[PDB]
Amino acid sequence: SKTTLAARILTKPRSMTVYEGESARFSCDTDGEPVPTVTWLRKGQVLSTSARHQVTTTKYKSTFEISSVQASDEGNYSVVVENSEGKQEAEFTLTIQK
């Protein structure tokens, strides 16, 4: 934080519920200095495109979309967005019933 910011999720990613990897898209706008950071995780070994999920990020706003789930991604998923000194997060359940 060259100036004096940190990490604050201006907006988080809503939740959803599908039978598998239909096409649920999400996005959380997080600000911070010089740039914030987003780490999706809850119970799927770092959501970070592990293999069944596919996340991504830009600068002050990350995004997570699911369409590859197999049979162990469960629903409840979250995102601990933080930065050089901030430490915030968000939550949303993305189930994949069958």
UniProtKB/Swiss-Prot annotation:
Domain Ig-like: 7-95
Annotated tissue distribution: Isoforms 3, 7 and 8 are expressed in cardiac muscle. Isoform 4 is expressed in vertebrate skeletal muscle. Isoform 6 is expressed in skeletal muscle (at protein level).
Domain comment (free text): ZIS1 and ZIS5 regions contain multiple SPXR consensus sites for ERK- and CDK-like protein kinases as well as multiple SP motifs. ZIS1 could adopt a closed conformation which would block the TCAP-binding site. The PEVK region may serve as an entropic spring of a chain of structural folds and may also be an interaction site to other myofilament proteins to form interfilament connectivity in the sarcomere.
Pathology linked to this chain's protein: Myopathy, myofibrillar, 9, with early respiratory failure: An autosomal dominant myopathy characterized by adulthood onset of weakness in proximal, distal, axial and respiratory muscles. Pelvic girdle weakness, foot drop and neck weakness are the main symptoms at onset, but ultimately the weakness usually involves the proximal compartment of both upper and lower limbs. Additional features include variable degrees of Achilles tendon contractures, spinal rigidity and muscle hypertrophy. Respiratory involvement often leads to requirement for non-invasive ventilation support.
The protein, known as: Titin
Subcellular location: Cytoplasm; Nucleus
Post-translation changes: Autophosphorylated.
Additional free-text comment from the UniProt record: In some isoforms, after the PEVK repeat region there is a long PEVK duplicated region. On account of this region, it has been very difficult to sequence the whole protein. The length of this region (ranging from 183 to 2174 residues), may be a key elastic element of titin.
